[PDB]
Amino acid sequence: DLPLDPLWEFPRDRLVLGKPLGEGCFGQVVRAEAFGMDPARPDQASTVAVKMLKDNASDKDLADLVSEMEVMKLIGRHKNIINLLGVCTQEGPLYVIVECAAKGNLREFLRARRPPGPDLSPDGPRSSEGPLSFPVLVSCAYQVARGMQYLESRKCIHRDLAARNVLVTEDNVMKIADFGLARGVHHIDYYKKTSNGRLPVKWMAPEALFDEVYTHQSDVWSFGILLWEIFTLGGSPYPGIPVEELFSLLREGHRMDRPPHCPPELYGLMRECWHAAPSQRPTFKQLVEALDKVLLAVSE
Numbered sequence: 001d002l003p004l005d006p007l008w009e010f011p012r013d014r015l016v017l018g019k020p021l022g023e024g025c026f027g028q029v030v031r032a033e034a035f036g037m038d039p040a041r042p043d044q045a046s047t048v049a050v051k052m053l054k055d056n057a058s059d060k061d062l063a064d065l066v067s068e069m070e071v072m073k074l075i076g077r078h079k080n081i082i083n084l085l086g087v088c089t090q091e092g093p094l095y096v097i098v099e100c101a102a103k104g105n106l107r108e109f110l111r112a113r114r115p116p117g118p119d120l121s122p123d124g125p126r127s128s129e130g131p132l133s134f135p136v137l138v139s140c141a142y143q144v145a146r147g148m149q150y151l152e153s154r155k156c157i158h159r160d161l162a163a164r165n166v167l168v169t170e171d172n173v174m175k176i177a178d179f180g181l182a183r184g185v186h187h188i189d190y191y192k193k194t195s196n197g198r199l200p201v202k203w204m205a206p207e208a209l210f211d212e213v214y215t216h217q218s219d220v221w222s223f224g225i226l227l228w229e230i231f232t233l234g235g236s237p238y239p240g241i242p243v244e245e246l247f248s249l250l251r252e253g254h255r256m257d258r259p260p261h262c263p264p265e266l267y268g269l270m271r272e273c274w275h276a277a278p279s280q281r282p283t284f285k286q287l288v289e290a291l292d293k294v295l296l297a298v299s300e
């Protein structure tokens with residue numbers, strides 16, 4: 001019923017729907033098997049993520065998914081974002097087929113890989129050694145910055161950059177997800193807690209929260225929060241601070257403390273991202289270059 005785009009259109013019969021991954025405000029995500037995503041290999045199997053309308057779908061929901069689809073087409077391909085692979089718009093439900101990151105989002109990736117605590121019996125020569133090291137953490141931050149720099153060059157504002165919206169591949173490559181969504185910025189329930197207990201307001205820049213103003217610099221603020229998440233190994237920002245208290249603290253210019261086991265170089269970048277004036281925050285290009293210096297210095 002939608003117009004046919006032969007550039008992106010993919011035969012829905014070449015999809016085998018599998019386990020549901022989750023869902024957002026609009027549309028659900030289902031893992032699926034795809035055959036011949038690469039036209040040079042028609043019978044080759046690959047794992048993809050399929051976005052589709054729920055059974056609740058109003059047209060507003062359909063409009064949002066169609067809007068997301070067209071955004072995907074225009075942004076282009078980059079290593080550090082979830083890329084569009086194809087769509088299904090003809091003779092059946094609307095499918096938006098995007099890349100699949102095997103290890104889930106960055107927050108859960110970090111939380112599941114926190115080092116063994118004071119309770120484990122020393123078994124082997126690496127008992128104190130956890131899965132996560134400092135240079136890899138820096139690499140995670142650096143890749144997200146590169147991805148955001150690309151999105152910025154494509155004039156794309158994320159408006160909810162967080163560790164939960166950064167996905168991790170089998171090779172630990174950071175991929176930014178859900179960058180092209182209509183997020184209803186004019187009707188945000190600031191007290192709304194997600195099913196996994198997240199308060200999205202804690203990632204909002206002041207100009208976004210108070211003035212409903214969104215720029216790339218507002219994403220830089222959110223990136224600073226994401227930096228805090230990474231080096232707390234998936235910690236929740238503003239620990240033990242309810243939304244009501246967050247409002248007044250932000251008005252007082254309150255900022256998060258330096259997390260434990262976090263070098264001053266990176267807390268310095270966090271605080272720079274949290275400067276009140278958006279113009280006094282680093283650009284993503286500057287963030288990429290700054291984090292690159294740290295990464296190269298620790299990559300002997």
Ligand SMILES: CCC(=O)Nc1cc(N2CCC(N3CCOCC3)CC2)cc(F)c1Nc1n[nH]c2ccc(O[C@H](C)c3c(Cl)cncc3Cl)cc12
Binds near residue numbers: 029049099103167
């Ligand atoms: C296609 C390979 C795959 O399964 N990937 C996967 C599984 C998951 N999960 C979530 C945890 C889930 N476990 C199951 C056991 O009980 C605890 C939860 C296992 C599957 C989450 C992901 F972000 C991903 N990674 C995604 N790759 N491509 C996506 C496209 C959209 C997408 O969106 C879902 C709603 C999502 C999810 Cl589920 C979690 N964080 C962020 C997002 Cl954006 C996730 C992925």
